[PDB]
Amino acid sequence: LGKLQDVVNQNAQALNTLVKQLSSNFGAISSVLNDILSRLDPPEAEVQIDRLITGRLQSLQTYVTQQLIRAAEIRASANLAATKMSECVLGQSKRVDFC
Amino acid sequence: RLITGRLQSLQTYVTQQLIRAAEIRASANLAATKMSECVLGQSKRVDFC
Amino acid sequence: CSNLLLQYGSFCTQLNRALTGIAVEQDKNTQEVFAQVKQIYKTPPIKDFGGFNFSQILPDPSKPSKRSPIEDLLFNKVT
Amino acid sequence: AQKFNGLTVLPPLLTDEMIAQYTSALLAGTITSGWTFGAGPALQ
Amino acid sequence: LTESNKKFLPFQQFGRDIADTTDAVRDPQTLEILDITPCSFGGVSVITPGTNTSNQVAVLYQDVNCNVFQTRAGCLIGAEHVNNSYECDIPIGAGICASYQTSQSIIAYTMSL
Amino acid sequence: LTESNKKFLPFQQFGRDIADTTDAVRDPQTLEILDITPCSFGGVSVITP
Amino acid sequence: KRISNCVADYSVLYNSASFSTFKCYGVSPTKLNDLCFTNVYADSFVIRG
Amino acid sequence: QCVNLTTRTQLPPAYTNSFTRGVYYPDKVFRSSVLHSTQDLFLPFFSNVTWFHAIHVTKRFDNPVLPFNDGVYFASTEKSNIIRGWIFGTTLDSKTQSLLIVNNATNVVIKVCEFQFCNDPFLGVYYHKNNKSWMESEFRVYSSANNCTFEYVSQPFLMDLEGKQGNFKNLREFVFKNIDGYFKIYSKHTPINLVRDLPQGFSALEPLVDLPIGINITRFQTLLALHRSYLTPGDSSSGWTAGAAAYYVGYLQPRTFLLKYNENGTITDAVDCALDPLSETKCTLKS
Ligand SMILES: *[C@@H]1O[C@H](CO)[C@@H](O[C@@H]2O[C@H](CO)[C@@H](O)[C@H](O)[C@H]2NC(C)=O)[C@H](O)[C@H]1NC(C)=O
Ligand SMILES: *[C@@H]1O[C@H](CO)[C@@H](O)[C@H](O)[C@H]1NC(C)=O
Ligand SMILES: *[C@@H]1O[C@H](CO)[C@@H](O)[C@H](O)[C@H]1NC(C)=O
Ligand SMILES: *[C@@H]1O[C@H](CO)[C@@H](O)[C@H](O)[C@H]1NC(C)=O
Ligand SMILES: *[C@@H]1O[C@H](CO)[C@@H](O)[C@H](O)[C@H]1NC(C)=O
Ligand SMILES: *[C@@H]1O[C@H](CO)[C@@H](O)[C@H](O)[C@H]1NC(C)=O
Ligand SMILES: *[C@@H]1O[C@H](CO)[C@@H](O)[C@H](O)[C@H]1NC(C)=O
Ligand SMILES: *[C@@H]1O[C@H](CO)[C@@H](O)[C@H](O)[C@H]1NC(C)=O
Fold it and tell me: Which residues have a glycan attached per UniProt (chain E)?
């Protein structure tokens, strides 16, 4: 099944990419925010923390946009499936090459 | 900062292209239904073909 | 990290609201497709429909699950 | 053009000739068979 | 640096296009107008027959000009060209696909509608 | 730190998963393999008539 | 004597209660085990009182 | 102390091809049922590589001072423990910290120092008359030593000092690396019944000891052991015997490798990304 497999694989790979985003520094000197706090003072390491915040915000925004587009496509497919049910299943449809 | 600016521009372009692709997909679905109904037969739907 | 997040709390509000809307839209999709009728119709015990064999789509009482043999084959096919 | 900056344009899978061939086949089917070819074998 | 067919006014040195890219420069040595065109175009693609079917693969170049077949969708190496047409399974572009048929090797042909 | 049922090769100390998260660290006390699972999950919600 | 690639506790070097004298400059004597160094050089010889 | 050899007819080195060899664990973490790709120095698959002989039947004895690149691969189909150990260094003139990783009949001895390394150190085994056992007597590995800081012994390792001319029964592979001065050892003994053309089977390499030395390294050379029986006159000029052995030396290159971790936790396959387009397709899809 191709249609039912893409909607799961795409979500799983989006979640995996979201997890992978936390392994990057986004141009900072470390990936985990605890390391810079333990090795540098908070007054000096503020800019690295803020850079990490901006990177995580950008990744989350991109994930939200991708999920919104996927949800719109799923909404369109669900409307199509509901119409197909109400026409071909709950009666006989005169539309040729639709059912 | 050049990396961040180019990344922002590319992301905005990708979002615009994805929205355009969604609209094109909707239009292509409408065209496919029209081809299946008005062309490959006679459609009883009034004010559709 | 939380102290600097008050400068972007509105962004997190929009993201959380978007995820909640996506979840409730996914929830509403099942109600628009499968909940077409509000009365649960029971399959008759008589299986003589003039020769039409419907055991492959009707549920079977041999298994505790209510899925049809086609649906059970469909569930295991996908991951 | 618009390809000098790495913005390559992918050619379509179906050329315009193949699309024209599909449209001509559909036209011939809809003038010689009506709707029988769209729901089964073509009937003259 | 190709030989161009357009002349400049005798006070200019550079030349741009509609997309605002410097693609024409006059040679100071002999007042010769030369065009500029980038070389690296597109990426590479791999044609795989599949698991438990074959082991050899075919490499397709996207927009690069060159056993070896110069298709309309770039350069295709590793797949011989045959003039007959069957139904195609692995799409490539510009109306020509590739498949694994008869030993047996990867072939490329124009698809049948 | 639950009691796992998977043994480790006698040269490793850490352990990850498919999603690349450290969730199995060998305890150096008497070579016990212990899983890691976060204790905090999700959020709260309210039902109002 | 060179101490390399080895684990060493200085607590047992102090509870002997047999040294007539003990001086340690450059680090507080009660907080040297937790501090980590690279190499330890030890020289042994005899001397008068 | 060391002595000089005499010129004789030797054999030129040959080139052989590897078959899915030179794969080790790039870290010390546990991974199960996951295809994880890492950037680290490994041995590329399917590549021509130099091969060195050690058989007597003639008089083949070659120990060149090969350059030590960023990681080497040392595989030997050892049968009667003819090989002993390895030495390292840059100039071998008591000016740098030259390594000496040898395996004596009682214990493994690792000591990096500034030994006065000769032109061709070797291990000498003498056959006693009243005793029917092969015993090592000529311990000529260096002239003298001045000073060093590292010395490691580990557990005793027992080997057989009797050399034969039969087919090999064991295969030993070694990988030596130096990242940030940290010395890395990877080895795993694998039984096999072959003389040449190493099998296409897969076997990972587990670390044994990890040395924190932090020194320089650019050259390396192996050590060999010859026998002095009653047939040879006993002089190291033209008459000796070395049994039958063969060791392969390969140089590691930085390539991304896609490892196959099973449910048990061991590597099963090492599909590449820069060897074949099919392998690149496999490792780009992470499948
Ligand atoms: C309806 O079709 C099913 C097919 O699944 C029939 O069940 C099979 O019947 C044959 C005949 O005895 C058995 O050998 C098979 O083992 C049955 N398969 C299963 C899955 O039950 C069933 O008999 C048919 N019923 C009618 C009335 O035609
Ligand atoms: C590709 O290059 C060859 C030789 O350089 C040339 O003859 C051929 O016309 C080129 N192809 C195209 C499409 O320009
Ligand atoms: C295919 O057949 C046509 C028929 O004329 C011929 O012109 C062409 O050269 C053939 N191609 C090959 C690859 O044999
Ligand atoms: C070197 O490698 C190539 C390709 O693998 C091979 O054809 C050649 O025979 C090798 N050289 C020798 C001396 O074997
Ligand atoms: C090699 O060194 C070990 C100690 O590490 C020693 O027991 C053994 O006798 C030595 N071998 C020879 C031949 O001296
Ligand atoms: C060993 O002695 C040499 C003098 O030849 C000196 O340069 C080197 O630093 C010494 N090594 C150590 C570890 O002190
Ligand atoms: C190590 O050797 C390199 C050249 O091989 C040299 O540039 C470098 O200075 C050396 N480092 C030390 C610590 O000797
Ligand atoms: C690895 O462990 C599993 C589970 O205990 C077992 O089924 C499998 O045989 C083991 N593999 C090896 C090579 O021992």
Answer: 52, 65, 83, 102
